[PDB]
Amino acid sequence: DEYPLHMAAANDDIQLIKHILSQKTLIDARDETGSTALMVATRANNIHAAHMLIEAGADVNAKDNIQDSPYLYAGAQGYLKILRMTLMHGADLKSTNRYGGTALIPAAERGHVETVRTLIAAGVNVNHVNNLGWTALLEAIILGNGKSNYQQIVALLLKAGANPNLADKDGITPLQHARTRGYREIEKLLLVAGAK
C-alpha cells in the first residue's frame, strides 16, 4: 500500500515495523494526512509500536494537522507508558497543542493524576497559560468536579509551586472559582498556598 509503516504502526505489528525500519528510509515519513507513524501509534495507544519507533529515532515533537505531537497527545490522553518514553527521548516541554497549552493542562483538565504528577516532575511549567486564558490549576477547578482526582491535582500543582493567584482572562481567580462552586477542599488548599 501507500504508507506501510503507518499501517503497521496502527496495528501494533512490531515484526512488520522491524522489517520496514530495516529498509533505512525516513522514520517520520508523512502519510496522506501529514501524520507520522509514531503519531498513528500514539493515537491508538500502541505502546510496543511506539517504543520501537521512538528507539529508532522518531521525533516525539513532530506535529500533525491539529498540532498534536506524540508527547502532547500522550499527556492529554493519560497514555502514561508512551508519555514516559517521550520524556526520555526529547519531549519539548515548552511545546503546545492547538489550544496553546502544554501537555500538563489537558492532563489536569481530564483528572489524570499520575500524568500530572509525571509532568510536574519532568519540569513542565505549571504557570503556563493557554489560549483560553487558563492554567492547569484553573482548568482543574473549572472543568473538574471538585472531588478526589481534582483535589489531588490541585494539591500537586500548589505544592510544586503553581501561583495560586494567576486569574482567568476575566480576572476571576482560582479562589473565586472554587468559592463560586462550593469546592471547600480546593478552597482550603488554595488559601494555605496564599490564594487571594
- Per-residue mark of binding to Cl ion, 121-160 (x: CB under 5 A): ---------x------------------------------
Could you say which of 4, 99, 122, 163 contacts Cl ion (CB under 5 A)? 99
Told to check if 105 binds Cl ion by CB under 5 A, we report yes
Residue of the chain from 33, 34, 55, 114 that contacts Cl ion (CB under 5 A): 114
Check residue 115 for interaction with Cl ion (CB under 5 A). Answer: yes
Nearer Cβ to Cl ion (81/188):
81
Q: What is the DSSP string of 23-52?
A: T---TT---TTS--HHHHHHHTT-HHHHHH
Positive or negative torsion for Cα 167, 169, 172, 175: negative
101 near Cl ion, rule: CB under 5 A: yes
CB nearer to Cl ion: give 55 or 114.
114
Grid cell locating 29:
515519513
Measured CA to CA, the distance from residue 174 to residue 186 in angstroms comes to 9
Name the segment binding Cl ion (CB under 5 A); options: 6-14, 53-61, 70-78, 169-177.
70-78
Q: Which of residues 13-42 bind Cl ion (CB under 5 A)?
A: none
CA distance 147 to 100: 26
Q: Minimum Å distance from CB 133 to Cl ion?
A: 11
Residue type, 171: G
Span of 48-56, 81-89, 144-152, 183-191 interacting with Cl ion by CB under 5 A: 81-89
**Binding residues for Cl ion, total number by CB under 5 A:** 11
DSSP 49-115: HHHHHHHTT--TT---TTS--HHHHHHHHT-HHHHHHHHHTT--TT---TTS--SHHHHHHTT-HHH
> What are the grid coordinates assigned to 181, written together?
462552586
20 versus 38: smaller Cβ distance to Cl ion = 38
Residue from 81, 147, 169, 184 touching Cl ion (CB under 5 A): that is 81
Sign of CA dihedral 54, 77, 105, 37: positive
Measured distance CA(148)–CA(136) in Å, rounded:
16
Minimum Å distance from CB 1 to Cl ion? 29
- Residues lying near Cl ion in the complex (CB under 5 A) are found at 78-81, 99, 101, 105, 112, 114-115, 130
